[PDB]
Each structure stands twice: as C-alpha cells, then as structure tokens.
Design an enzyme around this catalytic site. Structure first.
Site, mmCIF file in Angstrom:
data_model
loop_
_atom_site.group_PDB
_atom_site.id
_atom_site.type_symbol
_atom_site.label_atom_id
_atom_site.label_comp_id
_atom_site.label_asym_id
_atom_site.label_seq_id
_atom_site.Cartn_x
_atom_site.Cartn_y
_atom_site.Cartn_z
ATOM 1 N N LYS A 18 -13.102 7.044 11.477
ATOM 2 C CA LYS A 18 -12.514 6.312 12.574
ATOM 3 C C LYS A 18 -12.770 4.827 12.361
ATOM 4 O O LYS A 18 -13.520 4.157 13.093
ATOM 5 C CB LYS A 18 -13.066 6.803 13.883
ATOM 6 C CG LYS A 18 -12.844 8.279 14.075
ATOM 7 C CD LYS A 18 -12.904 8.657 15.539
ATOM 8 C CE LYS A 18 -13.296 10.113 15.696
ATOM 9 N NZ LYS A 18 -13.729 10.359 17.081
ATOM 10 N N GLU A 33 -15.758 21.688 11.479
ATOM 11 C CA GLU A 33 -15.923 21.131 12.831
ATOM 12 C C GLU A 33 -15.772 22.267 13.849
ATOM 13 O O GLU A 33 -14.790 22.995 13.844
ATOM 14 C CB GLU A 33 -14.877 20.087 13.180
ATOM 15 C CG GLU A 33 -14.874 18.777 12.413
ATOM 16 C CD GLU A 33 -13.922 17.732 13.076
ATOM 17 O OE1 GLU A 33 -13.257 18.019 14.142
ATOM 18 O OE2 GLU A 33 -13.828 16.604 12.541
#
Lengths: 284, 283, 284, 283, 283, 284
Positions: free
Chosen positions: F136, F198
């Site tokens: 990110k 994840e």
C-alpha cells in the site's frame, strides 16, 4: 540572459543523433581510423545573428570527448558576416564528421530565427513596442525556438496551454459571449493566471476591456481599426496586435500605443542561416 | 504514394502534445458546456495539401474524434484559400486542446509539399527528379521526407546509415577519390550504394572510372555539367546539387542528369496557412 | 574495424541490468559491506573467438566505478583456450557480483556468434566468397549480433528494411511478376537503394538478371542449379546463396563463382561460449 | 499454462519493430496494389509451438489485422513440417513489414520450448522437474521463461531480487556456509526463499542443518548426489545443476531430488524454423 | 469540474503497474479457473470520492474490463462505509493483478479530496478560497491538484514555469521588494502573474505600491492581516499562508482576503480506505 | 544497511524536476545572474528521524555542479530536533533555488515515513516482533518508501506481485478453498517462492497451517482470536498480523508470539517531516 542547459536539451539532441545514425556512419567509419586528433572550422557563409552555438557544441560533447576553440570570442547574439570564423572544433575525425550535420541543422535553424527576429525588430523601429513569438512553433522544438527569438531581441509569449489563459475565436464561439467566457475563465483559475482574449471586431474589444481582462489581442485588424481600438480600450487592458505580421507590414505599427506585436512567421516560416564546416586538418 | 502510419508517427505526436500541455489546458477546461461539437478546417492559402493523416491522428490519440470530408480531399490535392478541407467532430475539449499541434504539423508539411511542387514545375522536366537532403528539421526528418514525396519530389538517403556518401572531407582524408571508393567498397561490400561528391571534372573522371553508383556535381557551372555528362558517359548516375533555388532550377531543363537536390525544401520551407473556425454544437 | 560505443549500447545494458534487479540484489547486499575493494578474474572455459569484451566491461562501468586489468592484452577477435585469463575486474564486491551475470550473458552470447562465424568461414575455405549474416536476429540485439559476426570474420547484410530493397517471395507474389516488382521498386526509390531479388527457380533468376538488378539471391537451391544459375546470370548481377547453410553444408560452395553466402543460424541459433568469473580476492 | 499479455510484451515488440524500420519499409511500400490479403504461417520443422500470441501481437500493434486458425493450434501443441499453423489477414503493407519480427519471436520461443520438452522426455521422470536459469538472452528473459513453461519446464527465480541464492563467491566472502545463511535471514527475514550453491557433502550438511529452503548440488557425481540425498534427509529441497545436457540428463532418472536446472535451454537454444508463404489477395 | 484524461494519466499508471509486476503475478496466475468475474469496490470509510476514473483506467490499460455503477457514484460525491461505489467485470487475472495499483490511486486521491473538503467546511466562508501548493508528492502533482479541486479546493501555480513567485530568498538577493518586482516584469513582461511572499507590513506596502498581482502574507498574526488588508486596499489580490491546519483555518472567516493556501493537503494527507471484495463468477 | 544509488533513483528525480520546470524557473532566473557561488542551509524544523538525505543531495547533483558540507556529520537514521543544521549546500544560486522544492519534497516525505515507523516500533516495545511495510505504497515511489521504513527501524515485505505468493480473500474466493488455492500455488511456482495466506477466521487459519504454508496473515482479528490462532497454528507457519494497525492500537501486540505485524499507514498515510532551506549567503 539565459543560455540553454544540457538538462533542457540533451534528450532532444540524442534523439536527433539517433535519427541520423541507426546502425553506424558507414561513409566516415570506412575511411577513418578510430585513433587520431583533428581540427575543423565552423564558418558563417551568410550574414545575420548567431544563435544556438551552445547547442551546436553540445551535439559533439554528448557523442564524444571534443574540445572547442573560439579565437574571435563569438557569443550567441553577435552579428555575423560571411567568412567569419565562428568556432574551431577539435577531436577525433569520426566524431567531427558523424556529428556535423545534426549540429549544423540546429545552428542553422536557430540562427535563422534569431536573424529573422532581429530584422523584424529593426523594421519596426520602436522600442516601446515589443516583438513576441507564438505557439505556432515547430513541433518538439518550441523551447529552442523561443530561445532564438530572445537572442534576436524578441520576447516570449506563453509557452503552453498551461502557462496562461487565451480565449480564442473557438472558445468564445462555444460559450456564446465574450464576457461569459471571461467570467468562466476567472471562475476556473481564479488568481494565478493571466487572461487574454483574441478579438476580431471593435464590439468584442469593448466587451473584453469592460470585463477587465489582462490582455486584448487585435487579430488581423486594419490600422484604422487598431487606432480606434486603442482609444476604446483606453488603457484598461494591455494590447497585442497579431495576424499577418511580416517584414514589410511590421513598420505599420511604428508609434502606436500598443504594448506588443506577435508573429508566427518567426517560428513556423524562418529561413535558416547558412554555415559550413570546412578545413579538416590533422593535429601533427 | 504511401501514407504515414501511426506506428511511424505516434511517439512524435504524443511528445508534441506533452510539449503543449504540461498540466492542463486551463483556457479550454474553463468552458462549462452543454455535447458533441464540430469545427471546420479551412485552407487560408493556395498550395499543396500534405499531412492530413497526421493532422487527424493528433486528435485520435487524444480522444474519440470523428471526421468528415465533404469535398473528398487527399494528401496531394491542390488547394485554394477558403477550401473546406475537413470537418472535425468530437467533444469541445478535444477539438480545442489538440488544435494547435495538429495545425503546426499540417502547416509545416503542406508548406514543404508546396515548395517542392513549385520547384518541380519551375524545372519543367519529368526526366529529371527533384530530391531532398539531410538538411532537415531535427527529429522531423521522416515527416519532411513524406511531404517532399507528396509535392512530387523524391527521397535521398534518409541518413548516414542508409548509404555511403563520400564528401570533400572524406576524399581529403584519404587523399584520393579512387582510394576512398575502394575503402568504402571494402567496408560495406554489396548492400550499400556509394556516392561521391565532386567539384572538378578531374574528380568526376576518377569516380566514373572506379565505377561508383552516383556522382554529385557540387555547384558546377552549366558549361561544366554539360561536359561532365559526356565524360561520365552513363557509367554512374548523376546528381546536381548546391545553390538550387526556385529561380536557378530551370537552368537544368534540357540536361541528361538523373536528379537535382535541394536543402531549402526542408530547412527553409515557408509554412502553409490553415485555420480551424466555425465551432458549432451538434443536436 | 570498429568497436561498439557507449552511445550505441548504454540503453540496452541499462535495460538488461534493470531486468536483473527490480528492487535490489538481496543475496549480495546481505553479505557484503558497502565499502572495500576486491578483484575477480574472467576465465575462458571453452575454446573459440572472443567478442563483446567492451560490452562486458561497460556493464560494470554504468553500474559503478570499476577498473580493469588485462595482463595478456586480449582484444575482441583473439583466439581463446579454456583456462585463459581474459580479464581482471577491480571494484567493490557489490558491483562485481550484482553485474556479473548480465555482463557474462552478453559476452557469452557474442563470443558464441563470433566463434560460430569463424568456424563457418574456415569450413568454407574460400576467401573469394564472403560469409554474411541476415535479419534473422535476436530481437533488440541486432546491432550487437552484427558486430559479433564481423569479429568472427563475417560480413554484414542490410541492417533494416530501410537500408536496402529486398524483394522476397511474398513481394513478387503480390505484384505477380519478378520484373514488374523490380520496376516498381526502381520507381519508388530511384537511385539511392540497392535492389535485391530472392529467387527459387532458374526462370526467376533469368527475369531478374535481365531486368538488371544489383543482387540475386539463390534461395535453397541445389548445387546443380546454382552452377547453371551462375552461367545464366553471366555476371549481370551479384550472386548470393542462402537458405539452409550450416557448418556441414557450407563447404559445398567452395570454388563457386558466387559473391557471398548468408546464414541465419549465425544469429538465431548460436551456441553461446562458456566463460566464468572466479577467484574473488580482497585487495589487502 | 498462462499466456503472455500485451501489458507484458508491447514495449519489447514496439522496440523490435523500430529496430527493423527506422524510416520506412522501402521494399514493401514500393508495391502499388489493388485490398485485403492473406498469408499463411507454416511450420518448417518439427517440435513444440510457443509464442503464437506474441507472433500475432506484432501485427496487431502495427495495424488492424485478423487471424484464422483452421487447425486450432495453441501454444504447447506438437508440430510437423508443413503444418498450417495460422492464417494472417490484412493489408499487404502490414503483412510484409511485420513478418520478420513476428517470425524471429516465434522461431526463438518455439526453439526453446522444443529443447525443453526434449530434455523433459530424455529425463523421463515426472517426480523431477526441469528448471531454467538466469543465463538468459538479454532483455528477453520474460519471454524465454514462458517458452520453458510451454515446453513442460518450470521457472527458477526470475532475477537477483526474487530470491536469495548464496553462491561460491558469497560463501567465500563470509567464510562459512552457516554464517552466510544467518546473514541472509537477518537481511530479508520472512518473505524470501534462501538457496545455497554447494560443491562438497560438507557444505550440504551445514546448509541442511541451518534449515535452508533449497540446496543446489553443483556438478556432483552420481555417487555423491545419492549420499547427499540421504545426508539432507528431506530438510531442504534439492536441485542438481551444472553440466546438464540432452545426453547427461537421463542420469537423474531414479533420484529423490526435486529438480534439475539447465542454462542451455535459454543461452544456447536452436531456433525452430517457420515461414510465411502463399500470399493471396482476397476478393 | 473537469476530469482527468488518459492522455494525462496513462504513462503514470503504466509505470505504476510495472512497479508492481516485473515478471508476472505468480499468486493470481496460479489460479486455474473455469470465465468472466465480478468484484465489488466498497468504501470502508467516510469522506469524498476522488479518482474514480483513474481507478477504472488502471484496469482498462491492462485488459478489456467493464464497469457497473448501480448507485451512480461520481467524483465529488460524499461516501459512507459500506457504500457500493462500483462493480468491476472482467477476467479474474485482470481484476486481481490490477487491484492494488488502482486502489492506491483511489485511496490517495480520495484522501486528499476529503481533507480539502474538510478544510473548506472548517473555514465556512465561500468568499475565501482554499488553495493547494507545490508541496506535492513527487511525480503525482497533476493527480493531487485534481483531488484538491474535487474536494472544493482551488489550484495554485502548478510549478516554477507557470507563474512568478518572489520568495524571501529572491528579495534577499536583490535587496529590495520593488527592484525584484521590476526585474521580474522586465524578464517576463505580460504573460506571467507576479506574486510576492511577504513577512512584514513594510514589505506588503512596497509590493502593493509596485502594483503586483498577488501578495502572500506569510504566517502573519490576525491583527497584522487586518491591517495589511487595509494598507493594500484592493491593489493586489491577497493570499494567507503558513501554518494553516484544520483547527487554525477558522481564524480567517470574516476576512477580506482572496484565498488561503495549505501544503498539508498534498504532503500530509491521510488516505481513504476502500476495498475490493465479493469476487463472484458470472454465468 | 544500504543507501539508495543513483542507478536506482536518477530517473525518478529527473522526472520530478521536469514536473517542476517545463520551460524555465522564471522567478529565479529573472533575479539571479548565471555566475556566482552561494551557500544555503538545510534546517530541521521538526523532531523525528532523518531519511532521504542522499536523495535530497542527488536532486541538486543531477541539475548542476553542487557541493555539500556536513558540519554535524548527519546520516540517514539520526534522531533530529528543530533547528538542527542538517546540511549546507554550495553552488550557483540558480541551482540552489530551482532544485530546492523537489529536494525538500523527497526529504520531507521520506523522513516523515521513517519517523512514523520508528514511533510505531517504540509504541510496540517488543524486539521479538518486527514492524513491516506493505504494497500500500505511493504510486511510483515504492522503492523510496521501503527504504525509509528500513531507516526508521522497520522491515520490508514483498516488494511486488513477482517477489512472493500472497493468496488474498479474492484468490481464495475464486478457487473456493483455502487448501485448493495453496495446492495450485505450489503447482505453479514449485520451490522458489514463499507462500502466504491472508485469513479472517480461525477456520481458514487451521486449513492453511495444516496445508503447511510458510506464512499466515491474521487480517484484522481481535486480540482474543489472535491468541487462539497462535495456539492453533502451533508453530507450523510464521504469523503476521495486519489490518488497522496504528500508533495507538500497535501496543496490543506486545508480548504475543507472532513474528511480525505490518502496516499500510506507514506508506499511504505518513505525515511529512518539516524542513526548510534558509540563510542564503554569497561566498565572498
């Protein structure tokens, strides 16, 4: 005054060199030997104004280790006569000969512009009125062309559509008013942008001056008209005359209370200025 | 002839557009509008049309933009002022932001084609071709060569890699005409044309004898050229060059040379005036 | 002969280095210290011809300040044996190790080509016939590959579709004649371009020689045919043989009155030439 | 497997096209023609097809060009000489100008896939995978790796940033196998595979003990490898490398190693002959 | 306002994509799938939407990808967590590989617009405009300026070529305010706005008198600004700057200044959370 | 530790400079003279951690010949107070002033990140747990941002989608299983890639740990959950916590038997760190 920087020009000269050599320079490489120092002379074959000497030099310097010599101490701006020895170039033959044409094409193009500009300035014969260039430039050489104009005693208009607002015939058409267009422009870019309107009639000049714009451009207007436009506007905006301004016409503005005139011909139609590189000698 | 392709021109037009807009077009973006619009491309001056595809393409890289050609104009056609060359249809932002770049291409190219066609006419001899040079505008050679073709001209070597041209300096450095040619042939044996630039009838003799492909007569008197033709006697192709202008050019008319060449066509062309006017909204 | 110039190669080597490092060289950076001079040796592990030594060197020099040492004075062109100490490379460990593989991949590829070329020349055993490369090159390395061919004693065909005219099977198909195609070619690029025709039959060879083209290519023709083609053409055009020319085949041309032969295998199918970098030592 | 995307390949194909045409394609442009045309892509040699998308894409960047696949050929299919792999439809100028670049990609890629598939076959053991290396052609690694996949091979680390490989020089500079591994783990803690290149059974022991992910047995005898397998005892993955060729490769057949790797697949691949013939006009 | 165009943004998004994928997306390519798919773009946090076109465009450069906007969201709309901003339709490989880049643009831009809109609100005075600066993220200025507009802000000069700003250092080097202005006017006569950065009422007096276009009051007390307004007496436009934050900003409310400016809007913006969830296959 | 190299950064800084100057710096060029040496001082106006000093410097060095002076011997990593004299910059006025803003924008952005990172590390107060960055990142500055994180005492996650396998919510959705997705990943990139999953639920954590993946990411899980996840997984995979980790939250992990935590806020939402360049003086 500011010369041009390698940072500014390097990518363009590289591209031009690549344009001129996709594999190799067969003609030169066949004859020469990789080794051995030589000297060539740069001569002006035609009278005018020097512009682009740094650019000329830089063509060689990107290519190879190349030295110069300037016995007459010539600078961009100097007046020139045919036969003047502008510069001497020193390096390997392969470098001197492969780079020659590109370097000259820059020099010739730039000096041409500066010469045409200086000649416009002279034909105008009025310091109170400045000579400006335009966005009618050669594609991808605007930067170089604007510089040449400066060198010839001219001045620079907005560089880009990003530099300043210029509301043209087509902009005013699309809104439907002169004043609505100006209002919209002021609403969109409130304080940091100059606003200019391009105008054909005295009607439109009145609207604009009243709406308080920064600059009004009189497009291709008769001298009678311009005279009246001047009085109309009455100092409310700066005044630019443009369209169809050439070496013969330009004197018609002498003594008018306008701020500047601008010409596309200086950039889109400049005759280039002849130089040549002769007198190849080996150092020995 | 053969048109220019997006593959050839796109990177140059992209760059020119970026030149002209670093952030945004404030002037145009300021217009808060209702819709498709239409603008008309008018010739403001007489001559030869060149670069219409290029003109169009400037718009088409930027945005979805349509054209209309009511008078079916094509690169090569003769033009008069006021001719309606083309109509351009799209959003106002596209029409206006792209305008100047498109025109600068069109004006420059048409200018060259016009000057070329005029040289061809002043020559008035189909058996002799008009050639361009390497004295081109930097980074627009490709475009300029194309315009020359459109105007009825022909293309010299594109650059220093295309073909061998042994100039004054080259011959100087070897010391002979013939040794230079031999060395050139030794270096690039079969795939390269070899041309020699020549000032005297001496040198023309050497070159024709050594069997070169093209001899260039640099800035020679008409008496000389006449004799050179005879001397060479068809052994090499013949090019006249140096100091060839609209007035001079007719001096070649009778001659049994192959072509003449001019720099002025590329380095000193007056551009050809066009404009985009008559913005209207569609509905 | 002409070496390759940074101007020619830099963009390609940069791209290759970026190919090989997108963030960083973790393996090397983990172990090394930013500081400290070292030396590594470049050894030939296989016999053949050296090509691309400058290119090898240049990989390191773009990356970092790196010095070389050439105790045996090796040059592109020299014959090589396994175990020869070609070069010594001096600089920081990080530079020596991160750059290694790219440098070698250039060197190995180029030397491979030059070796295959020199071996073709030898197997031919006829100086009067030259060995040429083609456009059957590795994409985006043509320039480098043509150079290697030269280094191995070969010669360079047209670089590009822009360099010269070559009328292939497909061109002749599309016109419908050999002679109409040549005529059209001459009309399009009148004087400055060589014109070659690719030809399969003796029919087509006759048409071409008659229309006075510069070069005729005999595509994949039997020795009987070539012999007849030679006599047919009778010196009117230069003669090139091509298609399916390999180390074993190539001797079949020995003594023929053709001008050159050309081979794609030299560029599209070259075995690379083994080198390695061993003997890392610290200067101390 | 997964094909190559325009996003991945466009810049490389553009560059290759520019390589091949600096000004224009004189040869082809010289053809004054009536219209759509069709050319056929024929395999001239047996092996494995790879790079068909790439081949196609060369044309599609240049111009509007259609294909036809009558025998429904796909990357991976086996080929024989004379097979009609594809038909290409478009303007003559596009078909001819793009031809060589397209073929050079196709030939090179198919060559690699073929050599790979052949190594896989000569090995004759599915439990052992065939891997490529970093010994690639400069600026075509991506393409070459893809071809290897197509041929039934597998991909090693793409480059020096993908994964850690501690070579002879690295271990030399630290002085230990285990200290080097510790230092590597300290530098890139959890997200990087760590591999060690190893020449002796000593070093293999150290590495397996220090818990590395992959051990590479460099140029080891079969006796050695057999013992190494036992020594390591499943603690790390096992790679054999060095001096692996079409003849050698079968020596690995029984073994409980994970994979073998070869440079020859990328640096020394013979290309696979194709051609484009049978130009016809459509009407 | 006016959206961002592919012409403006494509090169930056291409670069960002290349940043994120050097070879291939191993994770995603590993999925062996049946077909079109659909993913949903959800706002995870309240604020202002900005960069939706940019978000979309990331996908459209990569691959053929369709959208659906059931709630007709547009750049500028207010958002709440859980809002279904958009639906994205295409192949799984495209949806997943492009996701992060697209979101990083969207999150960053929306973050800026939100912070801007909030400053505008805290100010609570339409007669005073909120301006951005050159204190931008490197190579994203264009994008950041756009976001500011979306949030109700306005654009300062884009860079050092757009307009003249005579700062402390400039005035220092000349030694006068007025000499510096004269020199600026002499250098770029009619086409450039001239602004002066000013710390004292002395300097504000000089500048207003010399007739400059814009005066910037650097970090001045409210007492001072009140007097400065009076001193200047409409001769120049007035900008307040320095140390302007969400809490401070309301101090300007009554004032007869033209605008205020803030760096924090571009150099220190908190990003705005979104996510892409709810992958479904179409059939 | 490794600094950033010109090879890594030059293209980005060039682009940024071009962003900031499309024609020329009118404001500076109008006042200055091409000639004449000057000195400017770089002051920290705010406390935190220094990062990007090389990058700062390099901005000037690409532009022009520019010298530095570091009287306090500051290095990337050093703790800073307002008023500290970080650096002195020496060169022509035009260079010092035109380059200033870009240089600062890099420095301010990077130092901001390193400061936010160091502060996270401190608030965590547990050496056994590492602080990681993410993908990110700010578009086209990832490289620079990852570096700053390192400088602040943080650590680097996978750089790229090419570096390592991370099976996210969407990947698992598209397969329909956690274990089928892992299997498919292992089949596709057999040995050279780390595989991470994840995970939102304890269900999914169990599946993953069982299928023997390298790393499990606990997405946005309550402390109660994480505690149980730890025991479940029972050392089978490495453990990463992520989602919604900020300066206040971060201490909640102190003492847990997880391997690292990761934060997007460090890269997408970093407050920049104020510096300024004051005290322009001529050398004289």
């Amino acid at each position: 005054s500011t010369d041009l920087t390698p940072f500014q020009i390097d990518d363009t000269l590289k591209a031009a060199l690549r344009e001129d050599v996709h594999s190799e320079d067969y003609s030169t490489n066949a004859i020469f030997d990789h080794h051995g120092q030589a000297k060539v002379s740069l001569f002006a074959k035609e009278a005018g104004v020097l512009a682009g000497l740094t650019v000329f030099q830089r063509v060689f310097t990107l290519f190879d280790e190349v030295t110069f010599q300037n016995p007459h101490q010539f600078k961009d701006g100097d007046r020139l006569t045919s036969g003047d020895l502008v510069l001497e170039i020193i390096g390997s033959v392969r470098s001197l000969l492969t780079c020659e044409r590109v370097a000259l094409n820059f020099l010739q193009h730039l000096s041409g512009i500066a010469s045409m500009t200086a000649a416009y300035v002279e034909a105008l014969g009025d310091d109170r009125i400045k000579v400006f260039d335009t966005r009618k430039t050669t594609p991808n050489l605007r930067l170089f062309e604007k510089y040449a104009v400066r060198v010839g005693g001219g001045y620079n208009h907005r560089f880009n559509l990003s530099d300043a607002i210029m509301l043209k015939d087509n902009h005013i058409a699309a809104v439907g008013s002169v004043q609505k267009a100006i209002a919209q422009a002021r609403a969109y870019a409130p304080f940091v942008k100059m606003v200019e309107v391009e105008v054909e009639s005295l009607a439109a000049a009145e609207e604009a001056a009243a709406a308080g714009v920064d600059i009004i451009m009189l497009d291709n207007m008769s001298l009678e008209q311009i005279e009246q436009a001047i009085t109309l506007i009455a100092g409310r905006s700066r005044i630019e005359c443009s369209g169809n301004i050439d070496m013969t016409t330009i004197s018609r503005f002498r003594g008018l209370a306008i701020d500047y005139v601008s010409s596309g011909s200086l950039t889109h139609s400049a005759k280039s200025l002849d130089f040549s590189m002769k007198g190849l000698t080996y150092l020995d």
